[PDB]
């Protein structure tokens, strides 16, 4: 008993149709579901009996299928529909779902808003050094966050997070943490953030000065 | 107002055991089958058990079979997972699902917000909370060296909503996470209207109220 999808992954236009499919192993009839979950919450369910919706569910979701091979279908594809969708087999054990199905969403590009951020003489106390840059509501996720310490380039002490996609805007934001000691960060003046974004037709540089 | 509140994660030792509850009410739990499906963490839903509305019949998912049992108490109008010899991942959000119709053969048509399950030898530690100060102006909270996940951050007692970013965890160097959480606010504000980030890591049981 195997379930399988495919694409694993797919970017689509506000507007678009959007279609994934799914093969079970052996004959399961009309036994299907389709669950979608939003990054951060629980799973709903959309179609089932291959092909009925669920209440309140809006009808630009549709299925279709029986035996082996079936469709979810997304019809107009909305902001709101960004997530990762599911089908599950129900007809008998086991009750196996498939790999999922991220799905992204459109969009024209956006730049970030960078911010810069120090740290606090309370962790300076606390014996080591924390700075964090912010790129805020930018498309693509593609971005580059070059750390500069005395305009030396940096290399091999950040970390980064990226925000799942807004469901409204359809935006991400990112977080770079540069970490390091408080004996090399009391050795400079000048920690900036360089950021490289495809909505940037230059880079833009953030910066502050102090100790 | 259909409600499956799970409990019982947390941290434990490989090799141990945990048993996850889950208190159904809205519907007539007595009448159906129930299911408990699980998520590791960035994988994919993963079905584990399942056991019909009079305990009739118990099905597992091979991965599991000898060493998890699904259980429930129709009086208690609860269902129940049993977990033992537990392995790095089994580490996972683990759901309970109510099944839309009478038959095990039947969608699960509403699901809890599950509880976290991480299965690790590294003690619980909590973490130290830092501002992050600075048109549009942006301030936020540095959550730093904390195990294990989850912890929570709202600003201003939840009256903050509009402008939140809260990032996802990142795993350091030392085994512990670290976590950010922002807000863009107008630069005008500052010095007139004050700004809180509040914080819960309960596997710790610390609530900070950092005040940027």
């Known amino acids: 008993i195997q379930m399988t999808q495919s694409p694993s992954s797919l970017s689509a236009s506000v507007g678009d149709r959007v279609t994934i499919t799914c093969r079970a192993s052996?004959?399961?009839?009309?036994?299907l579901a389709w669950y979608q979950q939003k990054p951060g919450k629980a799973p709903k369910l959309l179609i089932y009996?291959?092909?009925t919706l669920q209440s309140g569910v809006p009808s630009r979701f549709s299925g279709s299928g029986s035996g082996t091979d079936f469709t979810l279908t997304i019809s107009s594809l909305q902001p709101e529909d960004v997530a990762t969708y599911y089908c599950q087999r129900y007809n008998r054990a086991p009750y196996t779902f498939g790999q999922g199905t991220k799905v992204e969403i459109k969009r024209t590009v956006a730049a970030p808003s960078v911010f810069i951020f120090p740290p606090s003489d309370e962790q300076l106390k606390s014996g080591t050094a924390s700075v964090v840059c912010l790129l805020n509501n930018f498309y693509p996720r593609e971005a580059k966050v070059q750390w500069k310490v005395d305009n030396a380039l940096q290399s091999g002490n950040s970390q980064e997070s990226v925000t799942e996609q807004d469901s409204k805007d359809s935006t991400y934001s990112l977080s770079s943490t540069l970490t390091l000691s408080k004996a090399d960060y009391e050795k400079h003046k000048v920690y900036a953030c360089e950021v490289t974004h495809q909505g940037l037709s230059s880079p833009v540089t953030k910066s502050f000065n102090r100790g | 107002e259909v409600q499956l509140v799970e409990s019982g994660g947390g941290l434990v030792q490989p090799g141990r055991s945990l048993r996850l509850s889950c208190a159904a009410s809205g519907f007539t739990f007595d009448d159906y089958a129930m299911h408990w499906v699980r998520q590791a963490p960035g994988k994919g839903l993963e079905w584990v058990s399942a056991?019909?509305?009079?305990?009739?019949?118990?099905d597992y998912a091979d991965s599991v079979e000898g060493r998890f049992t699904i259980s429930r108490d129709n009086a208690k109008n609860s269902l129940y997972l049993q977990m033992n010899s537990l392995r790095a991942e089994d580490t996972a959000v683990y759901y309970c699902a109510k099944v839309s119709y009478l038959s095990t053969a039947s969608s699960l048509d509403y699901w809890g917000q599950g509880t976290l399950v991480t299965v690790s030898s590294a003690s619980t530690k909590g973490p130290s909370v830092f501002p992050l100060a600075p048109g549009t102006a942006a301030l936020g909270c540095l959550v730093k060296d904390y195990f294990p996940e989850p912890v929570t951050v709202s600003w201003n007692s939840g009256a903050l909503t509009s402008g939140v970013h809260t990032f996802p965890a990142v795993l350091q160097s030392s085994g512990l996470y670290s976590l950010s959480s922002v807000v863009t606010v107008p630069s005008s504000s500052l010095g007139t209207q004050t700004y809180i980030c509040n914080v819960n890591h309960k596997p710790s049981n610390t609530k900070v109220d950092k005040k940027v």
């Open positions: 056991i019909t509305w009079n305990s009739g019949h118990i």
């Open positions: 009996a291959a092909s």
């Open positions: 052996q004959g399961i009839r009309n036994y």
